[PDB]
């Protein structure tokens, strides 16, 4: 699943046995209950630009 459209994951994707897929996030993020979205858990997560985010 992961190979195609990143398995639907917002960040990282791991393949499991037949049809099973687990999305994961970079440190400083947590996975939402939808199983695909990542939300920041710290004030300054990597790869986000604070002046635009607070904009």
């Amino acid at each position: 699943i992961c190979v195609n459209e990143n398995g639907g994951c917002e960040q990282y994707c791991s393949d499991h046995t037949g049809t099973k897929r687990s999305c994961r996030c970079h440190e400083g993020y947590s996975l939402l209950a939808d199983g695909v979205s990542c939300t920041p858990t710290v004030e300054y997560p990597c790869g986000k630009i604070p002046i635009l985010e607070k904009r």
């Binding site: 990143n6 917002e10 990282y12 630009i49």
Partner: protein, 254 residues
Amino acid sequence: IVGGKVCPKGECPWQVLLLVNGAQLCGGTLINTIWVVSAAHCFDKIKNWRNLIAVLGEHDLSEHDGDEQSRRVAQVIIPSTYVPGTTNHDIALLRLHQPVVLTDHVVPLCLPERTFSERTLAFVRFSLVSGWGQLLDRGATALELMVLNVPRLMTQDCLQQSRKVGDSPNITEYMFCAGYSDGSKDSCKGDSGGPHATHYRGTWYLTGIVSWGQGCATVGHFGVYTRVSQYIEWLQKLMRSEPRPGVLLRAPFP
């Protein structure tokens, strides 16, 4: 950076300036609070290792505004496979002597997992490249951080779309081309080591390092960038290891 624009202050928060004895050396990319990724060739001529400084939160080189943070570079780690004065394996991992403090103007860029980078990031067409390097071939360097949006291409398409010089280095699996062949836009000397950064689903990731090219924005040629995805495991392992004495460390690759 040739043909780009000023990066509005704070919108390139992972950009690093490297200085030796106060003089502009190269760029770099912050990937967490103590580690910086740059280009190995930046360190070929350094004898004064204790005079190597990384600056975060920098924007305008003419004026201190208080957001700048300077750290001594405690270690420079280079892959065993890199040969000084040549193009392949052009990557260095720098450990700062003390962590930087994350702020609105100092934020790490995400180092992606390899699979995600190869399968997904490598196919995002445009990415940003940044630095205080020369504004034109044979020209002066920039006082304000510049940024440029460049398209990535397959290496097959690079070689086919480029004018043949013959003497030019091979483009290996550890590199990729990005930019324009019409002589309008490119990164340049002085930008070496800086980020090629790729946006995906709301977040920015490190995909390349300004490395080399034929002149700057030379008609018939593209910029060449270190293919960061090849080094993810190498970098991750090093960041989880204890520091060793001596500034320069050659570490086996793979």
